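Input for the complex:
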Amino acid sequence: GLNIFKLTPKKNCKDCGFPTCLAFSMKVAAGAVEIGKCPHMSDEAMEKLAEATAPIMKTITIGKGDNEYKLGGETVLFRHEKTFVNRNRFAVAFSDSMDDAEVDAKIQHIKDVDYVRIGEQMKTEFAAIKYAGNKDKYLALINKIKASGVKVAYALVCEDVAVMKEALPLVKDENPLVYGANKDNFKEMVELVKGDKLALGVKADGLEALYGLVEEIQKLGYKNLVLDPGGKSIKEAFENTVQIRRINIEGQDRTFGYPSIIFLDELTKADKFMEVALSTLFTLKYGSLLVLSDMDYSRALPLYSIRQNVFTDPQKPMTVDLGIHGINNPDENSPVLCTVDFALTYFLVSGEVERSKVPVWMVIPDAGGYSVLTSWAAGKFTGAAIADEIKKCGIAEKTKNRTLLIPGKVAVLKGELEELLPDWNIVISSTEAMFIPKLLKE
Amino acid sequence: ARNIKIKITEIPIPVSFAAAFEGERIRKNDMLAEFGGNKTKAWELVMCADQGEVEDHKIEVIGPDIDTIDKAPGRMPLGMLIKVSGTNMQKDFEPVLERRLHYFLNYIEGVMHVGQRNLTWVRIGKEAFEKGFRLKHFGEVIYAKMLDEFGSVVDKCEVTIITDPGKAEELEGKYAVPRYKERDARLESLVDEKVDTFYSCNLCQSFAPAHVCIVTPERLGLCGAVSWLDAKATLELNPTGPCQAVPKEGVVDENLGIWEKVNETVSKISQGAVTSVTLYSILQDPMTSCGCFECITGIMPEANGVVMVNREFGATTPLGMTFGELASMTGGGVQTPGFMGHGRQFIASKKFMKGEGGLGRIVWMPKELKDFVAEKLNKTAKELYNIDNFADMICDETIATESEEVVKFLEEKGHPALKMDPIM
Amino acid sequence: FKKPTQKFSGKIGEVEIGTGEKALKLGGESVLPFYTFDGDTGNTPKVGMEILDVYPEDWIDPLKDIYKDVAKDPVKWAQFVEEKYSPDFICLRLISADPNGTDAAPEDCAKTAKAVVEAIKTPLVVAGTGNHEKDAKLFEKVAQETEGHNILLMSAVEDNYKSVGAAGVMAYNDKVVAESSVDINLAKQINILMNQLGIDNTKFVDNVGCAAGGYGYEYVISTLDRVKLAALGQDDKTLQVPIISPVSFEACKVKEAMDSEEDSPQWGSQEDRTVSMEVATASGVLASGTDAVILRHPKSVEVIRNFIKELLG
Amino acid sequence: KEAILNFKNRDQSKVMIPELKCKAILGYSVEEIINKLDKVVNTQIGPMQTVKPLADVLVSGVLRGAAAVVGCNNPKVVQDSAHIETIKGLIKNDVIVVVTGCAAQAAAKYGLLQKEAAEKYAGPGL
Ligand code: B12
Ligand code: SF4
Ligand code: SF4
Ligand code: NI
Ligand code: NI
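Predicted:
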């Protein structure tokens, strides 16, 4: 970033929303903001820094405000090297040849599978509507999905340009993914898709053919592309995906710098457990949009949890909100518990309390996102912090029940907590969360 | 003759001994005995001695014991002289072992001891007295824990507890204060050129996969809790631990702090993520930072200098970023030229930014941090030949925070950084 | 464009578990998992089945229905598992030695392990409890009784690495698992301690920690990635040992798998959720660099074996 | 100060310093030797601060004897040749060698005043 700082006007005019040119240079160095934000940049420096700063992998935005999803923007091959930026999305595959009962069942499955895990809403993102040969039934299917009310983004999978020219205006205003560009129709697809700046799906036979097709499409002047790795088998598809990502990153080649779409329903032949295995594989192996034959809770529970874990920033652990977290509606005569702001620890303790089916007032002090032991070591989950959080949160609503449960890891805090909370009854609990229910039954 | 050591199964004390007993607060009216603090003179000392001078497992109590107390409180001097003998025992290991005393005593329920050296006070409740606790059990516990924890560096341990008013002060003057003064003198007089090996710590690689800390006498571990002597003690006590010796061989640049052996060690420890480092520079292959650093130093080009910010500072900085943004940009084990994460003891070091003219480039610093650092900073800048109070040339957040105002202040005050060569 | 030619100087060592025609080999690869387009993958990752030395009372209803007439006798349970499902190996977990639970003497568990190891031909993995002090004595007696079968002993942590290493590799010619808690540096430290003790890389495997999907899973994934990159890319000799992951130990214990359909009607079939959790955790750890996975449900073993065959074949 | 001021008269074009230096360890007074011998004294036996360990190794025959190598150089002998050959022969025969003066300096230049020299030149007992 200091390098781009040399090219900056150094006026510190605050016209870009950043107080100093160094701040702007560091913001564009991280890739958060493009360089076009500076009005006073010299033209030549702009023309050079456009190429110098351009990300090695392009981010593609699909969907409207509620269903907006970004795919791409990756910089490393392993999450420990640097965070993984944009998480993969899931599509449910509807087909023209499918009967009404199956379509209704899949619509209901998409609608029902929707929950929240640690503040994030897990639900199906995309509806991949494929063309099987009947244009009228395909239009009827896409209209039916649009009329059902499911909150999903649209991905039209149609090889025929003639059918797509009629299918696109039905969902054109929703910013869909247009798929079906080949070596013999990419000319007819770019002109159809470049007007509204919609994402264009590119497919071919093999990495070399795909590379040539993408080169031709880029020569046409279109960069809002989503690549489809080929492969007649699971092994070939895995090889193609891995090689596309490694060429983009290790090779520093921007021809393959686009998110990949993988049709897992076709590779797995509609096998639920094989779909789960391949989805877990491609969550870690550069698959950006995974298409599945169906979506239920058996699929969603592992896949969404693993996706939430993997695409967590290594330097920014997930945290829960602070203050009072009422569990099991714990009004009047309920034990008070305290734990650490860590998302994982809070999830574990909340699940254990829910299993016990007993009211509990849980108070979450500020801890820096560290765990029980390492937050005390850092100096956040101290007795003073717990006492201050108890004083300020508003736990004084209760009158009689005054037991305050403390993690067994921090046993030193008992004296300090009793000193700072003479009224409260500090009770050191066990060392593990499995214990929570049996000690609370006591 | 066979170097055979027999380990003690349990501590011979009536009072139960467990690690969960730390931090217990025990009532004032139950305080049978209280030594140290503003009331009495108490001290502790762990000193290396030759095998002849210390006899193994000899607990000597001199003066009245706690039994003689017949009033609700107790008030008598307490002096704990611990002599340790061993083949690998060194004076530099004395400050480490002594620290563990704080912990070794706190694991005993009924007694609470806190403090450093002669600043320690110990409070013993009457429940331990009823159980049968005496002053000899202090020696029993200290001997057992010294032979447990430091059994690889300590062969014999002798603990003497002194309660007489005369012998407690006589032994403190003869033994305690000279040890403290020589320890402080060694801490202050150690420089990079005097030593022949640095140390490398990778304890923060659990969250910063590429970070390697290079600890030198004049460059502290940026967590602030690891020093050169601490690294040496950790390497001796835990050879397979995070602190490993780095020979200072194959010098390339003495001013910028470039060594071929240091580069090789950093490359190996970081698993090849970091290739070349410079110890004394922030613009040429700087050292990485993890995220435990107390202070962040960032280059200010318009001032031709550097600004600093601690984690307790929440307002903006002349760089235009807060501490959170600087920490996000700097930490994570990534080499970011122009930004550095470091501790509070590294500011007033003669190796601080030695590759860019030294610490004379510090132009902005928070007011509380400036007040904390001023004495040592002024000493080092006087080594630079600057004025008696160099910290006055350093701008504060109250004086000026906008970059233009900071430069105006520097021009008014004649800050030396404005008269140096360009920083980058 | 240039094909990505990722050449690694390092190579994972091979460790052999079991005796006879059923003995398996772990490790031997010089590329990332399933990277058949980059070079040589040494041995196919192995899938083992978990059984208990006592009746499984906390297991889900379908699992107890599968082993209704064999779970009471560990010998019969192991024979049934080897006959009907024929896994790569069987992990006998000595739950009865848990000090928290119905604590049992090491002699009883050693006798059970000896009875089991003389009835099956597949390699056996004997896993202890979470208590290090109990584990040391238990593995002493287990390795003494099960001599001559080249079993694998799990959870040789730094606290008791000397005891399990001596009673295992050194005395009775067994293999051991050096376990470290989700840290590359801790894995290096335990490997270096084992090497300094007198145990080379051909005589133990590594356990860098395991976790269910969504419960500290990214730490396991990052540890596996870092260990694999250091062992292969950086040619780090202290990490060139195969990795074994017990997946069913944590995957089947989570709420997403344990809860029945009565507790969470919207979630659906309990068996499907259990199998899905096992499959997801196993697939992730296999893709990140593990060499053997322990599973519980037979359907999970079938799915994971098919997954491995599809990726490698 | 006279020596320092003469540095201005240095002619660097006439300077040739061979890059040949050798590490040496010295300082073995009788007191230092006794302090070193204290390491091999069993504490439960003693006594400390005596030459008794040296007397023991000499009496037992682990060391055959002790030899002092002293004296100057002489143009009649190839310089340092006799010192080095005598010292190497003696230590190879498990005779511990004490050196003084120009002989000691010949040993220092050659590299015999090193701990490593024990495994390079000495016999088994020494
Ligand atoms: C993971 C980890 C890290 C990760 C944490 C990841 C994260 N995002 O939180 C990171 C790398 C950040 C970390 C850092 C450090 N760590 Co650390 N860390 C650990 C580790 C491996 C486990 C902690 C953990 O994740 N636990 C799981 C979480 C989900 O559970 P938990 O919060 O511990 O709570 C458990 C119970 O208490 C219970 N529970 C919680 N609340 C309640 C309430 C009640 C009523 C009940 C009944 C139960 C209960 O629930 C959990 C069980 O399910 C331990 C190893 C060990 N031996 O414990 C070391 C360890 C705790 N770390 C340690 C240290 C010292 C540090 C550092 C200070 C130095 C270092 N590098 O080692 C740094 C931090 C530097 C700083 N000051 O900024 C030490 C702690 C020693 C001490 N002083 O106590 C350990 C033991 C390692 C070591 N030996 O050096 N660490
Ligand atoms: S608009 Fe450009 S010159 Fe003005 S403050 Fe922002 S980065 Fe600096
Ligand atoms: S910051 Fe401290 S603990 Fe972390 S690696 Fe550096 S010296 Fe070690
Ligand atoms: Ni650190
Ligand atoms: Ni840090």
